Symmetry: C2
Subunit: 48 residues, 2 copies
């Protein structure tokens, strides 16, 4: 569950860095974004 909630905060993180990338195209949001996709997989493996 805590793992699950970080699984969703990370999820949320994705959708927002997504939109914001969409509107300001700062390369840097780009890189963090990819780090949150990672956090996801790390989470998923740990998770269900």
């Amino acid at each position: 569950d805590y793992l699950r909630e970080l699984l969703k905060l990370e999820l949320q993180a994705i959708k927002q860095y997504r939109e914001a990338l969409e509107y300001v195209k700062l390369p840097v949001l780009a890189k963090i974004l990819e780090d949150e996709e990672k956090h996801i997989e790390w989470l998923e493996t740990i998770l269900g």
Copy 2:
């Protein structure tokens, strides 16, 4: 605004990752703190 939002997210995040890293010491989670630690760095720069 979206910048402050992102800021808040990661501050949210950094906070739970810590408790989680607290309750059970899985190096993955700290590996994720350092990431969220870079992002906040970066968010701060964009925020100047």
